Amino acid sequence: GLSDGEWQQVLNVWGKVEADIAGHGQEVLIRLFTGHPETLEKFDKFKHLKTEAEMKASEDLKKHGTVVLTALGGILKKKAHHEAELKPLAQSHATKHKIPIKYLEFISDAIIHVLHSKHPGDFGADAQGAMTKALELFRNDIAAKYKELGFQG
Amino acid sequence: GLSDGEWQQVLNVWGKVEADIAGHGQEVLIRLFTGHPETLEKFDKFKHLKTEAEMKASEDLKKHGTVVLTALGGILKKKAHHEAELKPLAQSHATKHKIPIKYLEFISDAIIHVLHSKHPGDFGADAQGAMTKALELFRNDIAAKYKELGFQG
Ligand code: HEM
Ligand code: HEM
């Protein structure tokens, strides 16, 4: 992962990206397509763009740059928000409480049991399967943080 | 992973948790501690509790259940938000556009170059290192989805 300061630095420069997203996106795609022309071959709708000049003149290349950098920014922000939720929990459960993954399994099963007991009319088989999967992701994600922190869970 | 409706089911039932978070948290920990009594040994303040009635009467246990379910809720919500944007991108770039991870590396290189060129004051060595790390996390998270989908990338 990234430190808090590092994520701050990523978000600060990304603010500069957002002040001119289309210009940035245009420049990123042109750099990509000039450096690695095979990548431009992936875009059938840019088949008419061959030269740098034509790439710079393209309305739709610029528009696509915006699409790309808007999507990337959102994913980077959402990753950071998730990492920040995991962080304090992994910290303490790895380095202080030392909670094995098998105990996280036991609490996950408890949660499913309680949900079924308290909401049998609204926590059917499908919804139960959804929660079972979400809790497995949660445990896997903590297990990956445990490893980063040096703890074998 | 979860489909979109599965995530929604997770969010929906957590809303129900949040309407009686105390009761839900109490029941979760009672289930855990009665099913797996060894887990009680982790809790200095609970490990004396033997019966369900005693566990229900403990204000400390009840308080803790709330703390646990609050924390888990925030992780689940933030995972869901990240997945909602990550999933469609991995899906289209594996299935339709067929974009190898190496081409994501190439566009990462272009992003790092463009940011350094445009914003050197906000993109010194540490800040660049942070962005390099954040784009690797992005690529790795797409690669994991690619493996789930059977796409070589
Ligand atoms: C930071 C990495 C990237 C992001 C965030 C990104 C984002 C997007 C988004 C949001 C779309 C539109 C919706 C969709 O189809 O998913 C799209 C379309 C597409 N992407 Fe990407 N992309 C990335 C990298 C690449 C790379 C490296 C290539 C090719 C070498 C590529 C090729 C395409 C193609 C061919 C389309 C469809 C274009 C069209 O005909 O409109 N992507 N991308
Ligand atoms: C859904 C899974 C879990 C969640 C969300 C969770 C959450 C929390 C939170 C938010 C705290 C307080 C702040 C902190 O120390 O991080 C905490 C404390 C603690 N947790 Fe967990 N926990 C989970 C599972 C477990 C399990 C299974 C065990 C043991 C079997 C455990 C043992 C402890 C202990 C011993 C403390 C300290 C209690 C105290 O001194 O007051 N946790 N947990």
- What domains are defined for chain B? 1-96 (6.10.140.2100), 97-153 (6.10.140.2110)
Question: Which position has the token pair 């959102």?
Answer: A74
Best residue for ligand 2 mutational test, from A96, A99, A103, A111 (most atoms within 8 Å of Cβ): A99
Look up residue A92 and give its two tokens. Answer: 């303490």
Look up residue A40 and give its two tokens. Answer: 């431009």
DSSP H stretches of helix in chain B:
4-19, 21-35, 52-57, 59-95, 101-118, 125-149
**CA–centroid distance for A22 within its chain:** 22
Residues 6+ apart with CB under 8 A from B3: none
Look at residues A73, A88, A74 and name the one whose alpha carbon lies nearest to residue A4.
Answer: A88
Residues 6+ apart with CB under 8 A from B80: A134, B7, B10, B11
Looking at the CA of residue B135, tell me the nearest atom of ligand 1.
1
Comparing CB atoms, the residue among A72, A78, A86 nearest residue B81 is A78
Ligand nearest to the CA of A88: 2
Distance between first and last Cα of chain B:
19
B147–A contact, CB cutoff 8 A? no
* Cα–ligand 1 centroid distance for A43 (angstroms): 9
Comparing CB atoms, the residue among B85, B109, B134 nearest residue A10 is B134
Look up residue A148 and give its two tokens. Answer: 């980063």
Question: What is the rounded CA–CA span in Å between residue B121 and residue A49?
Answer: 33
Query: CA of B70: how far to CAs of A75, B17, B60, B66, B131, in Å?
Result: 24, 9, 16, 6, 31
Q: Are B10 and A131 in contact (CB under 8 A)?
A: yes
Looking at the CA of residue B107, tell me the nearest atom of ligand 1.
27
Indicate the residue type of B14.
W
Q: Are A94 and A87 in contact (CB under 8 A)?
A: no
CB-based burial, A61-99: b 16+ in 10 Å, e otherwise? bbebbbebbeebbbbbbbbbbbbebbeebbeebbeeeeb
Question: Which position has the token pair 């339709």?
Answer: B96
Look at residues A9, A149, A153, A151 and name the one whose alpha carbon lies nearest to residue A80.
Answer: A9
- Judge if the beta carbon of residue B97 lies within 6 A of ligand 1: yes
Comparing CB atoms, the residue among A78, A80, A126 nearest residue B85 is A78
Measured in angstroms, the CA of A143 and the nearest CA of chain B are apart by 14
- Cβ count within 10 A of residue A113: 15
Q: Are A90 and B72 in contact (CB under 8 A)?
A: no
Residues 6+ apart with CB under 8 A from A142: A86, A89, A90, A93, A101, A104, A153
Given resolution (angstroms): 1.2
Residues 6+ apart with CB under 8 A from A97: B42
Ligand nearest to the CA of B74: 2
Look at residues B138, B135, B112, B108 and name the one whose alpha carbon lies nearest to residue B124.
Answer: B112
> How many helices (H) and strands (E) would you count in chain A?
7, 0
CB-based burial, B43-62: b 16+ in 10 Å, e otherwise? beebeebeeeeebeebeebb
Question: What is the rounded CA–CA span in Å between residue B153 and residue B151?
Answer: 6
Looking at the CA of residue A68, tell me the nearest atom of ligand 1.
7
DSSP H stretches of helix in A36-58:
37-40, 52-57
Q: Largest Cα–Cα distance of chain A, in whole Å?
A: 66
User: Which residues of chain B from 117 to 136 reach within 8 Å of chain A, CB to CB?
Assistant: 118-119, 122-123, 126-127, 129-131, 133-134
Q: Are B9 and A127 in contact (CB under 8 A)?
A: yes
3-class DSSP state of A119? coil
In this structure, what are the phi and psi dihedrals at residue A98, rounded to the nearest 5 degrees? 60, 65
Question: What is the rounded CA–CA span in Å between residue A38 and residue A26?
Answer: 17
Look at residues B24, B60, B90 and name the one whose alpha carbon lies nearest to residue A131.
Answer: B24
B99–A contact, CB cutoff 8 A? yes
Question: What is the rounded CA–CA span in Å between residue B137 and residue B143?
Answer: 10
CA angle A78, A79, A81 (to 5 degrees): 65
